[PDB]
Design a protein around this ligand. Structure first.
Ligand code: CDC
Ligand code: CDC
Ligand code: CDC
Ligand code: CDC
Lengths: 252, 253, 253, 253
């Protein structure tokens, strides 16, 4: 078992009388001497440290028979820049990752993109992460070059677990709980009633409009009729009436 | 035959050393002595004097074997009062009736309603006219009392003839003739047609406008409804689902 | 007097064993022994039989001390042909003449021009008509040959009356009455149109009012919605700080 | 280092041919020969497993030179019952504890109170927890009997962290956000209502204008009609005096 936490990058003596030399998959998988383990670097936010992270690092720890696991954790600043908010700030996460079972070494304030000098500084043989492309601003995959170096080691993501999930359970519950403790009833009932009332009113208004339209149409029709009559008028008809009337003047 | 016209009432000597005595149907129909004829009175407007009148007076002249026919003709004034217009005034009608074949005597300016003193003055035995009730103002029949006296003698009206008819033929013809000589034209007709067309067009336009207005109103109503709906919606249950995901966008992809 | 109408020619018997022998102006004016009256012929349409006609016939009857008056009445066909229309129809005018006072005998269906044989069968001694030469057919006078025989007796037209006047009065009155009435109806139509326009304006007003009401309702609804929103908003901080704590109570202290 | 997770209790073999014999603070702190580590028990929900937990476990692991750390994780049922809810579910927390650095073995479905037999089967030498007396059930401390046995090893709570805080941050942020969003929508909603009201009024005005126009058109039409009527009326007297005469021409001169 292990009594003490994982050394931060800084705590350890490192020797430059030893040149930078990576191993290859073959002689790494044959497994390295105990003095010279294979050195692997996994990186990420590790916000709300959870099982997915942990067995990702387990996968990574197990890649080779003899392995030394260094884990880069990104700063709050960088993470808010390129990604979004952390619920837990960088220190909590450093502690968090420090406390993991498969972790030999923790690297604070780790870079979004990995550089030749980073890889040389920390003597990294391989880089463990999931094989999805990581698109962080300006790059479609920030692991592209490490993949190309033959350096990249893919891992598998746990399903059902993720920080987004852990956040969404809580938020989900609190939303309905809060909204529920708002309406706490008469008013709510009234509102429902009001909507119904409003609807009824709207219907009435529509009906009224329709009626008005009908009236207008009728008026138009009447006008048309009048016009027609006028046209017709414009003696043949009224002669029959003219004569009899004229002769009324002469008696019964 | 007869050379001279019928005496007006005035021209004749009349004697009051002879009391007023009417006869009755029986001894009148046995026929009277030549010195004492039966005396009968027929009356009316006699406007546009015609055959109906004439054989009415013939009927009347023939009522008894010996008969003297006096015919009352009403004045213009009275006739316009109680009846209507005459086309011919009273003098023309006096002449007219004077010239009839069966007429012995003419009575000018005769009364609408006959009075005891009229009947006594002119010594009238009987009064000849058609058996229709004559309704002249205030009375349902102005012959009622003469009918009751046993004095009345009915007559028959000729059919097809009457002053109204004689007037209506003329008026009928002149109406259509005149109206006909008015429209007398093609150009005018064309113009009228054009005007009508224009009117129709205008009407159509108006209708279209109305329709448009209606449509607008409908649209407005719809908008109002939508607004109401929105308000109702506003009045968390719906937008929570959207609130949460959005909230979690903040934490990354 | 005379109780009976005038015979027609065909109603009458005539002795032809009596040769046709006319009589002179002289020995006629000496007067004609009772059984040989002078026989005079007068002719015409007698349309709208009137007093001019009648007095013409009176002159005719009085031309001699003893005179027999035969009067020809021309047919509808002859008359429509050579003259013009008639408001009276030939039978009506036959009757008309029949009821005249100075007329002994009526001759139906009379000739437009008079012939030796016509004058023979009716044994006509003289002819009575006005002395204005009569132009119809191609004849510039149809009586000229009767003149030349010295068989003509002129008469005098009466004044202010003739069949045309009687027409003209009625005609006029009906022309002015018709036309007047024609205008009045148009005025009534104009009055109706006023009514219609006013009704349309009121309907428009009503519509406007309705629209206004609708608008008001909408406004009210909006206000209500706003109020609701406000209420919702209110429903939160203090009771929030209450909420969260309450919610964490459930998982423990 | 450590490539492998922590066993559970049931994953593990145990020799019961070895009787249950505890060890003193003293001879434990002298250090325990490799094959007999001291065995320490620490317990808890470990909901939202965090650094306070982990350091608690580190203390637990370091209580002696040679120490075996067994850690009980209470169930969802026990926990919901005697404590409150958990956002983490018992399997999740089993795993959580499994991945801790100082933890040799994990015990699933742990007791709320510890029993002689529980302490027997797991061969538990000591117990590591904070020294704040734990009040749940009716017990005002559930560790008191473990205290009295002298079997208790206190530990220290870390600072500024605990499962409740992690809740509270998110809670707060979402309260202010959700309320803030709701409020913006009310702000947006009011503006929308204003747009709706502005739309309503303009439209109404337009409608009114249209109506007015229609009315005007109608009026114009009426006027036109009137004019036409007038014209018609104008279109008779002179030609009247022409007419009547013309009409009397037909009956003769
Ligand atoms: C910024 N980079 C790209 C340099 C480092 C990667 O950044 P990231 O966002 O992948 O960090 P993260 O904390 O989300 O993921 C950390 C590691 O845990 C793994 N992981 C995460 C969640 C999960 N349910 N299963 C996992 O296996 C990821 O594959 C990743 O390899
Ligand atoms: C005023 N009165 C009642 C006193 C007299 C009658 O007035 P009147 O209107 O009957 O006079 P009139 O000139 O219309 O009718 C005169 C006479 O002719 C008769 N007559 C009239 C028209 C006709 N087609 N046939 C007729 O027999 C009527 O019966 C009446 O007897
Ligand atoms: C056709 N004829 C010649 C055979 C017959 C004469 O035809 P007419 O046109 O003279 O007939 P008419 O009805 O006009 O006239 C009939 C008679 O009435 C007389 N008459 C008519 C109107 C009047 N105002 N005065 C008259 O004296 C005429 O002299 C004529 O003798
Ligand atoms: C129910 N029991 C008594 C059987 C087990 C204890 O239950 P609990 O409520 O202490 O469990 P928990 O998850 O709250 O605490 C787990 C462990 O982490 C430690 N812990 C937790 C939070 C913190 N800020 N500091 C700590 O030292 C506690 O001392 C405890 O020993």
């Amino acid at each position: 078992g292990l009594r003490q936490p994982a050394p931060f990058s800084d705590e350890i003596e490192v020797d430059f009388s030893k040149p930078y030399v990576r191993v290859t998959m073959e002689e790494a998988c044959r497994g390295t001497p105990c003095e010279r383990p294979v050195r692997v670097y996994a990186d990420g936010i590790f916000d709300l440290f959870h099982s997915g992270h942990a067995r990702a690092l387990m996968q990574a720890k197990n890649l080779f028979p003899n392995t030394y696991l260094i884990v880069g954790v990104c700063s709050d600043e960088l993470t808010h820049n390129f990604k979004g908010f952390t619920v837990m700030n960088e220190n909590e996460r450093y502690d968090a990752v420090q406390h993991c079972r498969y972790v030999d070494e923790v690297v604070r304030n780790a870079p979004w993109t990995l550089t030749p000098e980073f890889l040389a500084e920390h003597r990294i043989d391989f880089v463990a992460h999931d094989d999805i492309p990581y698109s962080s601003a300006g790059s479609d995959d920030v692991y592209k070059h490490i993949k190309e170096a033959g350096m990249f080691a893919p891992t598998q993501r746990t399903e059902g677990i993720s920080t987004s999930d852990i956040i969404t359970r809580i938020v989900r519950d609190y939303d309905v709980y809060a909204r529920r403790n708002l309406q706490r009833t008469a008013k709510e009932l009234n509102v429902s009633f009001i909507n119904e009332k409003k609807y009824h009113l709207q219907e009435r208004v529509d009906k009224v409009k329709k009626k008005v339209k009908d009236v207008e149409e009728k008026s138009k029709e009447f006008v048309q009729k009048v016009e027609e009559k006028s046209i017709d008028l414009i003696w043949e008809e009224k002669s029959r009436e003219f004569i009899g009337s004229f002769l009324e003047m002469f008696g019964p």
